[PDB]
Amino acid sequence: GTMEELARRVGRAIERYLNGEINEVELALAVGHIFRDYGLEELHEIVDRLLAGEISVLEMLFRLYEAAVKLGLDDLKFVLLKAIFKLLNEPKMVKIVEILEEMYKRAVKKGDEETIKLLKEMLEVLFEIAKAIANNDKEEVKKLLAKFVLLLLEMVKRAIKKGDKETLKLIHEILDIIAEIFEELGDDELAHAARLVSKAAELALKGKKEEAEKLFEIAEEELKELIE
Amino acid sequence: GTMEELARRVGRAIERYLNGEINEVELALAVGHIFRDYGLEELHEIVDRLLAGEISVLEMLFRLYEAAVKLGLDDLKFVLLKAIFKLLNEPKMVKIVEILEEMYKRAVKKGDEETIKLLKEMLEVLFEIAKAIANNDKEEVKKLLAKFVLLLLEMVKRAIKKGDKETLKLIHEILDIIAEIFEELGDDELAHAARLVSKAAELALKGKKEEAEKLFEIAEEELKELIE
Ligand SMILES: [Zn+2]
Ligand SMILES: [Zn+2]
Ligand SMILES: [Zn+2]
Ligand SMILES: [Zn+2]
Numbered sequence A, B: 001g002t003m004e005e006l007a008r009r010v011g012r013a014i015e016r017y018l019n020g021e022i023n024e025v026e027l028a029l030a031v032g033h034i035f036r037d038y039g040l041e042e043l044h045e046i047v048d049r050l051l052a053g054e055i056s057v058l059e060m061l062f063r064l065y066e067a068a069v070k071l072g073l074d075d076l077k078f079v080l081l082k083a084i085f086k087l088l089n090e091p092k093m094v095k096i097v098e099i100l101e102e103m104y105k106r107a108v109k110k111g112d113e114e115t116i117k118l119l120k121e122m123l124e125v126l127f128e129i130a131k132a133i134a135n136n137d138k139e140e141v142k143k144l145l146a147k148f149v150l151l152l153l154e155m156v157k158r159a160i161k162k163g164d165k166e167t168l169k170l171i172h173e174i175l176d177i178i179a180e181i182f183e184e185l186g187d188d189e190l191a192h193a194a195r196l197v198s199k200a201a202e203l204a205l206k207g208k209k210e211e212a213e214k215l216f217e218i219a220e221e222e223l224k225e226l227i228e
Helices: A003-018 A024-037 A041-051 A057-071 A074-087 A091-108 A114-134 A138-160 A166-184 A189-206 A212-227 B003-018 B024-037 B041-051 B057-071 B074-087 B091-108 B114-134 B138-160 B166-184 B189-206 B212-227
Strands: none
Touching: A003 A024, A003 A074, A024 A041, A041 A057, A057 A074, A057 A114, A074 A091, A074 A114, A091 A114, A091 A166, A114 A138, A138 A166, A138 A189, A138 A212, A166 A189, A189 A212, A189 B189, A212 B212, B003 B024, B003 B074, B024 B041, B041 B057, B057 B074, B057 B114, B074 B091, B074 B114, B091 B114, B091 B166, B114 B138, B138 B166, B138 B189, B138 B212, B166 B189, B189 B212
């Protein structure tokens, strides 16, 4: 069928595994069969590696995400990222991925192609964040989250000069979630920068977009200073 | 003896009651004896009302605080406010009161007398906050907290033109606690204003006090709009 059906089928199989309905061998067989039905051979070999017990579910998910990035399947990428952030106990990152997925679905139904590359770059950043979390290395997580906040700053700057309003609310929600994540990570300066960007976005949405820019360059210099 | 030891004795009695070591009759008798020893008759009658069972511990604490406000005892005021905010399960307000007590204790050992009036006004605002919380009326709590944030903003504006450094850290911590309180109350705009003031204070303390003023009028304008 179409690439949208494959993503939904794979996602459903993964939720069945995660909820405890099926086990690892059943999941491997089902997902390998689904990939074989659609002609995706490399994904099939990656799942075969799980069927042999060489790798685990998390490593298989990471390799599947890399292969889908090489191939260019977007809905499968979102499904795999949600599964990765659900295997690791982080609901906030799953919420961020969900909001990004809704933004991508809104963007693809119109002619907006500039936001697509920015969403792809943020997907790369989220993938690196997940990889760093799997490595239990907390120092790179903060830097990657700072890069993600800068990318959201770029997108909100682009969107303010346009008439988009739902994008503003979604970016505000995402920035609030990252601020909570930073607070839970024992950091206060990066949380303050994220909340500054969120406040600027809210001010621009309200109607007072004259005061937003001062906050905007203030937050960007703070973010640039804190990365180094 | 001196009023400093009276507050310590009363506070120790109240913590003994709160920890479950002594009961209400024992606490009433002990506190009435302490007040009678130091010659405070009105406080003794207020405690006598508790001994007769007419009022409860929280009501007695409220009337004791009002009587101490009329008399002008500061350490007793702080003790009574901490007891009030401990009877109501709000550790964050107790932390705010503790930081205010440290601020007042630092101020009294030097010649700073202008901060005393503002600390007294903030104590009045905190007393109103406690009264509103006891009434379970959540709408006035947010407005009173907004007034408290405005007072803290005025104090940080006064302190920035001076050379104090620990003070700025103290308003920063207080404002962060108030922002957490606002977030837990299901509000986002007032929390954003409190975090804006805290960020301005942090920036001024760091050394870049030129960027803090824009934040200062932005936050104060937002607070003024949100109060009405
Ligand atoms: Zn096979
Ligand atoms: Zn802070
Ligand atoms: Zn008596
Ligand atoms: Zn917000």
